[PDB]
């Protein structure tokens, strides 16, 4: 479906309606310093590693919209509930 | 599964061992210092149970009765010389440097003074080709050009008992007798005729191998069967 790049909607930070910009959530790179990364190093030895021996699962036929709604004046972003869309293209 | 036949081999049990107690001599070259004044007379010609070829019994000048690897045309009464200044006659042992080019040689050493490693089986010979101050190129019975140290000793002539492979065994009984004198388990049951538990090619409703016969070099013992690291297979092409 088609989505407008810029449009007027509510801002939970400013507490009033402002012109928001829509952007797709880009995956932030991992540090490899969280607890789970340290547990992967610790709990891995001879033989099977339990949960750390599992490989990433499949995909759903259609993913939900992963979007960021950036405010035009205060410059802060907010997250919303996504909806199933096979393709999401922006207008302007 | 169960360990394959080739694995039971290495354990060195009775069935796989050679009848060493029935063997005559470890046919090595004599230990001379430097001088060549070591010669001997051939007393007898005996049969060697380890190689199915004849072996000459020689008595040396100092009184040492040793069995030597007999070349062709060596008889009782004949004098054989061992050393650096030795005569270029069939049955004499002298280093590769002193032996002229184009002369068939046998019982060649790998490292000088080992006693002879190459060209020892019935009727075979090594061919001495090139000379140098550093290297003596010898052409081994397989057709390989072996670069050797000129100080490596060797006996002149082809090994005795030539043409052994020419006559067929005809019957299983003759093979039985030959094999009872060697370090080999005989008869040979095909893997394809065994159970899956016993061999990689075992099993099936009919007799055929499981996967293809050409196995990798990196294959572990128990799986390395069939055609080991074959560069090619078949006759044609």
């Amino acid at each position: 479906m088609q989505m407008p790049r810029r449009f007027n909607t509510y801002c939970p930070h400013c507490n009033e309606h402002q012109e928001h910009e829509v952007e797709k959530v880009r995956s932030g790179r991992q540090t490899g310093m969280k607890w789970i990364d340290r547990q992967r190093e610790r709990n891995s030895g001879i033989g099977n590693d339990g949960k750390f021996s599992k490989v990433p699962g499949g995909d759903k036929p259609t993913k939900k919209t992963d979007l960021k709604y950036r405010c035009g004046e205060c410059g802060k972003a907010h997250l919303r509930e996504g909806w199933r869309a096979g393709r999401l293209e922006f207008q302007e | 599964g169960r360990r394959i036949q080739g694995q039971r081999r290495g354990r060195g049990t009775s069935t796989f061992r050679a009848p060493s107690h029935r063997y005559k001599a470890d046919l090595e070259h004599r230990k001379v210092e430097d001088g060549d004044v070591i010669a001997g007379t051939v007393v007898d010609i005996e049969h060697d149970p380890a190689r199915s070829a004849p072996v000459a019994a020689v008595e040396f000048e100092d009184g040492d009765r040793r069995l030597i690897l007999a070349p062709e045309g060596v008889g009782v009464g004949d004098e054989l010389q061992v050393g650096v200044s030795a005569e270029i006659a069939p049955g004499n042992t002298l280093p590769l440097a002193e032996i002229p080019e184009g002369v068939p040689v046998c019982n060649v050493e790998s490292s000088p003074g080992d006693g002879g490693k190459f060209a020892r089986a019935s009727g075979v010979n090594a061919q001495l080709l090139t000379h140098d101050r550093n290297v003596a190129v010898v052409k081994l019975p397989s057709g390989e050009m072996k670069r050797l140290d000129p100080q490596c000793r060797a006996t002149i002539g082809v090994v005795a008992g030539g043409g052994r492979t020419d006559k067929p065994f005809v019957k299983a009984g003759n093979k039985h007798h030959k094999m009872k004198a060697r370090g080999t388990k005989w008869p040979n049951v095909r893997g394809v005729a065994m159970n899956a538990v016993d061999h990689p090619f075992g099993g099936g409703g009919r007799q055929h191998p499981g996967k293809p016969k050409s196995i990798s070099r990196n294959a572990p013992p128990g799986r390395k069967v069939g055609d080991i690291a074959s560069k090619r297979t078949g006759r044609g092409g």
Binding site: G45, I46, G47, N48 | -
Partner: protein, 194 residues
């Protein structure tokens, strides 16, 4: 002023530097041709020996022992084992090479008792340790106010029961507080969790 001993100590802080580098390169050639346990008249590291309890007295013996480098010489499982217990290569023994050296020495000398030991280097394939052993039955030791404790019946086979300094360190008994909950008073009393 500095002792002559302090110089043997300072040389051994870096066994790959100076005159000692050349000394060890020469000595190891003779050591590689020596046995498993070789009794020596005098210690290679006098400072360390004396520091550990050695005295130039009767009944005080020193012996150099060579033990192989690396992990456990483990045989693979011949029966059913879960993936976690199927290893061969990465398994290491719980006793250190120094403790193996002390035990081998004590067996070569059944009448003597292990006092202490120290490292005297290694090459690519083995490690060498010199073990100070004591004769509990010699009167030269039964009358020594510094060493006569080793003569007591309860000090019999002290090395095999882990009563050596290397024994006590390998048992995790160094720390008196945090971290030594499963090690003191013994590994066995704590259900073998140390």
């Amino acid at each position: 002023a500095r002792s002559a001993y302090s110089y043997i100590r300072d040389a051994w802080k870096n066994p790959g530097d100076g005159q000692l580098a050349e000394l060890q390169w020469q000595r190891q050639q003779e050591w590689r041709n020596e046995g498993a346990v070789e009794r020596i008249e005098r210690p290679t590291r006098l400072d360390k020996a004396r520091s550990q309890g050695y005295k130039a007295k009767q009944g005080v013996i020193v012996a150099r022992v060579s033990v192989r480098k690396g992990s456990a010489r483990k045989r693979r499982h011949k029966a059913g084992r879960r993936s976690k217990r199927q290893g061969v290569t990465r398994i290491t023994r719980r006793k250190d090479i120094q403790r193996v050296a002390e035990e081998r020495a004590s067996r070569t000398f059944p009448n003597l008792r292990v006092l202490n030991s120290y490292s005297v280097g290694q090459d690519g394939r083995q490690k060498w340790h010199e073990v100070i052993l004591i004769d509990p039955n010699h009167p030269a030791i039964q009358n020594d106010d510094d060493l006569s404790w080793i003569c007591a019946d309860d000090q019999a086979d002290r090395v095999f029961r882990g009563l050596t300094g290397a024994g006590r360190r390998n048992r995790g008994l160094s720390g008196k507080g945090k971290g030594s909950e499963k090690t003191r008073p013994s590994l066995r009393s704590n259900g073998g969790k140390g």
